[PDB]
Paper text:
In this work, we report also the first prokaryotic CβAA structure at a resolution of 2.0 Å. A discontinuous catalytic domain and a dimerisation domain attached through a flexible hinge region at the domain interface have been revealed. We identify key ligand binding residues, including a conserved glutamic acid (Glu131), histidine (H385) and arginine (Arg291). Our results allowed us to explain the preference of the enzyme for linear carbamoyl substrates, as large and branched carbamoyl substrates cannot fit in the active site of the enzyme. The structural analysis provides new insights on enzyme–substrate interaction, which shed light on engineering of CβAAs for high catalytic activity and broad substrate specificity.
N‐carbamoyl‐β‐alanine amidohydrolase (CβAA) constitutes one of the most important groups of industrially relevant enzymes used in the production of optically pure amino acids and derivatives. In this study, a CβAA‐encoding gene from Rhizobium radiobacter strain [name] 8606 was cloned and overexpressed in Escherichia coli. The purified recombinant enzyme (RrCβAA) showed a specific activity of 14 U·mg−1 using N‐carbamoyl‐β‐alanine as a substrate with an optimum activity at 55 °C and pH 8.0.
Author numbering:
A (entry chain A), B (entry chain B): 7 to 415
Amino acid sequence: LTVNGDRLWDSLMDMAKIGPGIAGGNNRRTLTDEDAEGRRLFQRWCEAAGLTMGVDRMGTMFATRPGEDPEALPVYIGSHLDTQPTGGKFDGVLGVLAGLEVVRSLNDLNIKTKHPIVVTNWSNEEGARFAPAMLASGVFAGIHDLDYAYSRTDTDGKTYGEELKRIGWLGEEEVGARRMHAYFEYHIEQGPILEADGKQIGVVTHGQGLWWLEVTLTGKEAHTGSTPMAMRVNAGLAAARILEKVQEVAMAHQPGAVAGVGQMIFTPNSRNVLPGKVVFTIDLRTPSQAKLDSMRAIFEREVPAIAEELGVGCSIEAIGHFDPVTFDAVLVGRVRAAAERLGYSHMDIISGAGHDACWTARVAPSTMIFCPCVDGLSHNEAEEISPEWAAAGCDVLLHAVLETAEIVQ
Amino acid sequence: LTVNGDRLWDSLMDMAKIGPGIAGGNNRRTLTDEDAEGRRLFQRWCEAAGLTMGVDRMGTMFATRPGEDPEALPVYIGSHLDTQPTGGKFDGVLGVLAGLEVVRSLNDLNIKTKHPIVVTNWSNEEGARFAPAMLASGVFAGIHDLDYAYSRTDTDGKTYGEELKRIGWLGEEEVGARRMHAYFEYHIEQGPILEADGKQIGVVTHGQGLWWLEVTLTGKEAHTGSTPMAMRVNAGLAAARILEKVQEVAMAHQPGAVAGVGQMIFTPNSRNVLPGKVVFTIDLRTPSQAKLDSMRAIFEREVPAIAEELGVGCSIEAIGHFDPVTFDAVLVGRVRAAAERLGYSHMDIISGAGHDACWTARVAPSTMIFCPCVDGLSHNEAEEISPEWAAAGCDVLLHAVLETAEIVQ
Ligand SMILES: [Zn+2]
Ligand SMILES: [Zn+2]
Ligand SMILES: [Zn+2]
Ligand SMILES: [Zn+2]
């Protein structure tokens, strides 16, 4: 049994035509008109494949294929259609549309299952327009209330909840109200491991835990000409030395830990004035609870000490956190076995990023499947997979789901 | 014997009322309409003091007080009325309005001079809106042609030359056509030295030379979750290590050198994506030619080696440069002597920043006078001096000018 990879591929290219970016990728941020366009197209496809559409109060979309057991809970296949402003075509979209290809493959064969199958598009997974990321799955898994989620505002000062109403995807359903037999998410690695190790299938075992530590450094705004070295209070240098320490800390915890900085903000950011304020986020991740606690403790001690070294003030706010996630070992094994059975090359991998699956794992037996991506490139328009990679993992998805939903024939 | 410090102070407070900033300072950037308003008020004052106004093709304003010798070249008293967006009330303004106070004090006493005195408001000294700084004095001293200066455009894409015409300060006079007997500029220190050493008067002997080395680092945009440490090409860490090098190089060149970074720009600047591009300016300065060449050479060699260490691409563009300026020893001497005779405390100081004086020094015997400023604060709305500080240095200015222009009696 396999999926129609050509049909999968075509769907990916059709969805990529909505909210196209500036370089062959996508800018289809959550709750834009472009996102509404993608939602509608997906719904059209879902209906054409015999699925009934449910929508929750966060706008998550649940497309149900009936099971033959009316008491059986559904096997959910989820991801997200929303993208980064420099979005790739495959991040998120692959998982959603793989779920759709699974259905279509089951419809082609008239397969009946005991469990219903529900293909799921989570609202605002990316957290690019409204933070946090994984916002709708967050409410679903009880991580935060609807109120909190609704009040998230974008860089235009519009709220999530207003925008959700504006495009008319404020659904009827209570968020978190569905119980899942199981949850699968198929996604690109967003990293270079599978490609570099030549593996078609990443058997996701865990998701790495993280802290986002937002560091605000307070310097003295001082002309870089007229201020002698000995009288500088240099928040940019402090930031710099902290970035070194972050690298040193990450390296002391190898293997299987990361830390680094993506976002750095100097104020005023003039060429001839030392910053009054420097803000940055230390992103530290590991599947190892001990390493995550250890890096976080180290940062809490050393970051202000490095600031203090330069007379720079320092406050640290935890703006993101979850502990390492263990995917359901039975579902993991199904994915591993299916990859073996299908003759695909495969390895076990840690999910480096968070996904909606990391939240569903709290309320439901959850796992993920990875396919490779070229050069580990993600969150960028040049993000690439082959149709062969797309289909390989969708095949593993088909098998793992069908084993879980249970074929009636 | 002295200036009216009350009248000086009042003029400062009147000028600070035009294009007021957010917080006690000024946003009266060059060739804004509020710049035009400041120009107009200064002209009104100038005319009421018996000065005739000339304007060059850059909009520099030259207010002449007659001399008794019709062949004598003028003693120029210059600064600028344009401010940083978060400008202080005193930067530039003090010099121009001190020139006006000198005139008024000479008029109060009906003093005649051999040399005419010209009060000068240079256009776009700050270089906030249209870069570089010292644009009008630059053209005056032949550093750059009118073409280049006119073609400077702001962040809105309006050109300097359009804007100059818009406000109707495109003057008749050929830029650089005036020959100066002498040039004085009275300016705040913009640094903490005079304040820290309890001196009222900075006798400026030299202006430090500079290089501005804009470094563009090319990294790999890579998710900070999904990318293993060993596969990162981290342009932000490269930037960090370069900032540390910059500090270590600065500290090796003490005494009498600076280097540091005010401007840092990460792209895309997301929390979960390592930058594809980091741009920053290494601002390095010293009155020592040897140390300036040394620092420059060391950066040109070591910055790419730091980048190469991390696999980061590196490109260095010199975006600004002038050599150390020696102010005219005779005019320096007069400033020092006038401070001594008047009983003000005083020290020799190096101009940390560039000023219009540093360009006039090419075509004319030039010097500067500094007064203190609170905490070295400049290019910020909380930039502060006392009326006492303002007046002490304007007194030294009156004496130095009158000795140079020569009293008739
Ligand atoms: Zn995703
Ligand atoms: Zn993503
Ligand atoms: Zn100035
Ligand atoms: Zn200034």
